[PDB]
Design an enzyme around this catalytic site. Structure first.
Site, PDB file in Angstrom:
ATOM      1  N   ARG A 239      -4.955  -1.281 -17.200  1.00  0.00           N
ATOM      2  CA  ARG A 239      -3.887  -0.255 -17.243  1.00  0.00           C
ATOM      3  C   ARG A 239      -3.243  -0.347 -15.672  1.00  0.00           C
ATOM      4  O   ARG A 239      -2.004  -0.279 -15.548  1.00  0.00           O
ATOM      5  CB  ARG A 239      -3.749   1.148 -17.818  1.00  0.00           C
ATOM      6  CG  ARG A 239      -4.677   1.836 -16.808  1.00  0.00           C
ATOM      7  CD  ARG A 239      -4.873   3.290 -17.556  1.00  0.00           C
ATOM      8  NE  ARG A 239      -6.059   4.131 -16.751  1.00  0.00           N
ATOM      9  CZ  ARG A 239      -7.373   4.053 -17.093  1.00  0.00           C
ATOM     10  NH1 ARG A 239      -7.631   3.423 -18.186  1.00  0.00           N
ATOM     11  NH2 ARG A 239      -8.124   4.764 -16.339  1.00  0.00           N
ATOM     12  N   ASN A 240      -4.195  -0.655 -14.741  1.00  0.00           N
ATOM     13  CA  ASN A 240      -3.674  -0.457 -13.408  1.00  0.00           C
ATOM     14  C   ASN A 240      -3.577  -1.673 -12.499  1.00  0.00           C
ATOM     15  O   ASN A 240      -3.270  -1.786 -11.475  1.00  0.00           O
ATOM     16  CB  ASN A 240      -4.828   0.424 -12.514  1.00  0.00           C
ATOM     17  CG  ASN A 240      -4.334   1.955 -12.771  1.00  0.00           C
ATOM     18  OD1 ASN A 240      -3.363   2.454 -12.914  1.00  0.00           O
ATOM     19  ND2 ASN A 240      -5.608   2.619 -12.760  1.00  0.00           N
TER      20      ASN A 240
ATOM     21  N   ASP B 224     -10.202   3.871  -9.419  1.00  0.00           N
ATOM     22  CA  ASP B 224      -9.559   3.895 -10.579  1.00  0.00           C
ATOM     23  C   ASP B 224      -9.347   2.506 -11.239  1.00  0.00           C
ATOM     24  O   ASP B 224      -8.107   2.036 -11.812  1.00  0.00           O
ATOM     25  CB  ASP B 224      -8.029   4.583 -10.860  1.00  0.00           C
ATOM     26  CG  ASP B 224      -7.618   5.112 -12.071  1.00  0.00           C
ATOM     27  OD1 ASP B 224      -8.682   4.894 -12.976  1.00  0.00           O
ATOM     28  OD2 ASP B 224      -6.575   5.326 -12.273  1.00  0.00           O
TER      29      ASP B 224
ATOM     30  N   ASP C 244      -2.706   0.599  -7.978  1.00  0.00           N
ATOM     31  CA  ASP C 244      -3.245   1.874  -7.944  1.00  0.00           C
ATOM     32  C   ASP C 244      -4.652   2.190  -7.541  1.00  0.00           C
ATOM     33  O   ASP C 244      -5.003   3.288  -7.571  1.00  0.00           O
ATOM     34  CB  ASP C 244      -2.922   2.546  -9.412  1.00  0.00           C
ATOM     35  CG  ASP C 244      -1.563   2.996  -9.599  1.00  0.00           C
ATOM     36  OD1 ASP C 244      -0.836   2.994  -8.639  1.00  0.00           O
ATOM     37  OD2 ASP C 244      -1.223   3.468 -10.847  1.00  0.00           O
TER      38      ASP C 244
HETATM   39  C1  LIG Z   1       8.218  -4.347 -16.278  1.00  0.00           C
HETATM   40  O1  LIG Z   1       7.350  -2.982 -16.328  1.00  0.00           O
HETATM   41  C2  LIG Z   1       6.955  -2.744 -14.955  1.00  0.00           C
HETATM   42  C3  LIG Z   1       6.175  -1.367 -15.082  1.00  0.00           C
HETATM   43  C4  LIG Z   1       5.711  -0.993 -13.742  1.00  0.00           C
HETATM   44  C5  LIG Z   1       5.797  -1.511 -12.645  1.00  0.00           C
HETATM   45  C6  LIG Z   1       5.200  -1.239 -11.492  1.00  0.00           C
HETATM   46  O2  LIG Z   1       4.593   0.051 -11.370  1.00  0.00           O
HETATM   47  C7  LIG Z   1       3.924   0.504 -10.215  1.00  0.00           C
HETATM   48  C8  LIG Z   1       2.881  -0.173  -9.955  1.00  0.00           C
HETATM   49  C9  LIG Z   1       2.067   0.418  -8.878  1.00  0.00           C
HETATM   50  C10 LIG Z   1       2.572   1.362  -8.182  1.00  0.00           C
HETATM   51  N1  LIG Z   1       1.731   1.943  -7.104  1.00  0.00           N
HETATM   52  C11 LIG Z   1       0.791   1.637  -6.688  1.00  0.00           C
HETATM   53  O3  LIG Z   1       0.192   0.750  -6.967  1.00  0.00           O
HETATM   54  C12 LIG Z   1       0.345   2.362  -5.364  1.00  0.00           C
HETATM   55  C13 LIG Z   1      -0.803   2.184  -4.334  1.00  0.00           C
HETATM   56  C14 LIG Z   1      -2.049   1.123  -4.883  1.00  0.00           C
HETATM   57  N2  LIG Z   1      -0.546   3.029  -3.463  1.00  0.00           N
HETATM   58  C15 LIG Z   1      -1.495   3.106  -2.441  1.00  0.00           C
HETATM   59  C16 LIG Z   1      -2.834   4.126  -2.872  1.00  0.00           C
HETATM   60  C17 LIG Z   1      -3.769   3.411  -3.776  1.00  0.00           C
HETATM   61  C18 LIG Z   1      -3.699   4.107  -1.228  1.00  0.00           C
HETATM   62  O4  LIG Z   1      -2.582   5.386  -2.942  1.00  0.00           O
HETATM   63  N3  LIG Z   1       0.439   3.647  -3.503  1.00  0.00           N
HETATM   64  C19 LIG Z   1       0.905   4.637  -2.542  1.00  0.00           C
HETATM   65  C20 LIG Z   1       1.628   3.795  -1.531  1.00  0.00           C
HETATM   66  C21 LIG Z   1       2.245   4.404  -0.597  1.00  0.00           C
HETATM   67  C22 LIG Z   1       2.317   5.679  -0.611  1.00  0.00           C
HETATM   68  C23 LIG Z   1       1.596   6.602  -1.787  1.00  0.00           C
HETATM   69  C24 LIG Z   1       0.852   5.988  -2.851  1.00  0.00           C
HETATM   70  C25 LIG Z   1       0.956   3.481  -4.478  1.00  0.00           C
HETATM   71  O5  LIG Z   1       2.137   3.748  -5.068  1.00  0.00           O
HETATM   72  C26 LIG Z   1       3.724   2.063  -8.590  1.00  0.00           C
HETATM   73  C27 LIG Z   1       4.480   1.420  -9.689  1.00  0.00           C
HETATM   74  F1  LIG Z   1       5.628   2.215  -9.885  1.00  0.00           F
HETATM   75  C28 LIG Z   1       5.430  -2.013 -10.085  1.00  0.00           C
HETATM   76  C29 LIG Z   1       6.254  -3.030 -10.474  1.00  0.00           C
HETATM   77  N4  LIG Z   1       6.606  -3.567 -11.310  1.00  0.00           N
HETATM   78  C30 LIG Z   1       6.585  -2.960 -12.663  1.00  0.00           C
HETATM   79  C31 LIG Z   1       7.143  -3.300 -13.770  1.00  0.00           C
END
Ligand SMILES: COc1ccc2c(Oc3ccc(NC(=O)c4c(C)n(CC(C)(C)O)n(-c5ccccc5)c4=O)cc3F)ccnc2c1
Ligand SMILES: COc1ccc2c(Oc3ccc(NC(=O)c4c(C)n(CC(C)(C)O)n(-c5ccccc5)c4=O)cc3F)ccnc2c1
Lengths: 278, 278
Positions: B157-158, B153, B171
């Site tokens: 946006r990610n 993905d 993400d």
């Molecule tokens: C100031 O405005 C913001 C807005 C969003 C923010 C922000 O948003 C996120 C950005 C990313 C994520 N999560 C991920 O990128 C995840 C990823 C890459 N993974 C792993 C995978 C891709 C294999 O799923 N996961 C994840 C990790 C562990 C367990 C489950 C999912 C995630 O949660 C979660 C968020 F809340 C993080 C930090 N600062 C921010 C600041």
């Protein structure tokens, strides 16, 4: 053309999965000999330390390409390996190879899946026999629910039958899905209970296709209109009542698998005459 | 109403995930303070042993109900925690609670996601700036591909942006998907390369929506007809050529992220004038 880079996997997880891994020191796969509907499955033989042989089925997970999928595959292995119940199919082990797809190793089930067994006209199960199969599935689902495991695809085709006629619960299917699963996309033990009711219906009709006259896309409306699978010719009234409760529009009002085992066990004991004694 | 039974989880896996788990001895979640598009995310503070504070984002995985999903959640945690690259968002830890949904803990990204950053008219990125963001994403994807991780993905946006304007890769999205992903449903590093080309297009248009005049269900035919995103007003010819190669109908003929980093790095060096220096 499958060459998975095993060094790319995480160390802690590989350590966790060791107790599930089996290899060429124990397992002979007969790649030229197929078990013909459940993917690519081969005959295999598993030897213990003194050379005693166990007949197994060896499924090749040919979709698993990337390390995410392999990591998820390992996790599924760890989970399944813990399960131990006579009505839940055992995981004998998994194979993590540097060449070729990952393999899953299951005990050989002489009589295949329950749906094909009951549909085969050369078999002669009695009403007691069919209810007995249903009770065995309920006991397996009771165990799984106790472990907080949600099945999601419970159906006669996914239940196996061994040489002693023991039903082993194993493994889109809209005609088995709870009303709430069809619309909210979510699955629970309560939705497994709904699928169990359809499975009971399959049993009592010896593997008839459910809702023959309703399209798969018209099933939600059919169910919302309050319509349900008709009572099979061989299904007794008390069992049909159990089915109806399994299809309660309110998931919270459906019986538990523990409740089902108790109720169905009482029904089974009032029946006499069996050709497939467990 | 989320009460997950943690005793139901497997012991070997819980052992594997310990190095990823963080708890109330280190983390303060501000459940009354939201980070507003990425699910339910709260402001949090993470303390080391001497009481030094780190600002984090704490995402609550409210869908995760059953032990299968929790086991998969743990596995994703183990995988992500190993990754260490300045252009890939770090996992600070996860929280496995007996009450409330599982939590994921990420470093706070001051400037949010890249798409919202470049769309904000009060920011003034130069062509060099936008290409620089693209190069940073490529370096992160190069690292991930080296670890055999398939993103699936990839989109502006990610990608996140920290206080030093470092892009962190983090993400359904049919207008970013490779031709082969749209039809065979499968994803690879080569399909990530296609999505990367669309991301570059997003960058050079400062977050314009791609293919504005094609319905999402007409995208496969559009692409099979040999049509592609038009060259943005601010996109130089050599960068547009890179984009076109990213959308090669033959996945095998697309450049690697390693090739992209090299090519884009050469393009970036010929540009001058920046407002967001890394
Ligand atoms: C100031 O405005 C913001 C807005 C969003 C923010 C922000 O948003 C996120 C950005 C990313 C994520 N999560 C991920 O990128 C995840 C990823 C890459 N993974 C792993 C995978 C891709 C294999 O799923 N996961 C994840 C990790 C562990 C367990 C489950 C999912 C995630 O949660 C979660 C968020 F809340 C993080 C930090 N600062 C921010 C600041
Ligand atoms: C004589 O005819 C047959 C026909 C099929 C047979 C047969 O088919 C299978 C029956 C079941 C399965 N697999 C499963 O039930 C699996 C289950 C329940 N899991 C776990 C989970 C549900 C969580 O995915 N997995 C699994 C396990 C580990 C890794 C990946 C998937 C499985 O492969 C795989 C099979 F090849 C097994 C034994 N004997 C057979 C005999």
């Amino acid at each position: 053309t499958v060459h998975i880079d095993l060094s790319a996997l995480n160390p802690e997880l590989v350590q966790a999965v060791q107790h599930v891994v089996i290899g060429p020191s124990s397992l002979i796969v007969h790649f030229n000999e197929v078990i013909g509907h459940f993917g690519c499955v081969y005959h295999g033989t598993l030897l213990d330390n003194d050379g005693k042989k166990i007949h197994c089925a060896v499924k090749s997970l040919n979709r698993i390409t990337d390390i995410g999928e392999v990591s998820q595959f390992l996790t599924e292995g760890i989970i399944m390996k813990d399960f131990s119940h006579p009505n839940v199919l055992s995981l004998l082990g998994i194979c993590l190879r540097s060449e070729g797809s990952p393999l899953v190793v299951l005990p050989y089930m002489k009589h295949g899946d329950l749906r094909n067994f009951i549909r085969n006209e050369t078999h002669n199960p009695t009403v007691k026999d069919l209810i007995g199969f249903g009770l065995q599935v309920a006991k397996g689902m009771k165990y799984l629910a106790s472990k907080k495991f949600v099945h999601r695809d419970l159906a006669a085709r996914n239940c196996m039958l061994d040489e002693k006629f023991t039903v082993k619960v194993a493994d889109l299917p809209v005609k088995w899905m709870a009303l709430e699963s069809l619309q909210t996309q979510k699955f629970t033990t309560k939705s497994d209970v709904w699928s169990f009711g359809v499975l009971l219906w399959e049993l009592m009709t010896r593997g008839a296709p459910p809702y023959p006259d309703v399209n798969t896309f018209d099933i939600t409306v059919y169910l919302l209109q309050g319509r349900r699978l008709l009572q099979p010719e061989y299904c007794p009234d008390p069992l049909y009542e159990v089915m109806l409760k399994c299809w309660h529009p309110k998931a919270e009002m459906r019986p538990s698998f523990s409740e089902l085992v108790s109720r169905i066990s009482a029904i089974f004991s009032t029946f006499i005459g069996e050709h497939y004694v467990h």
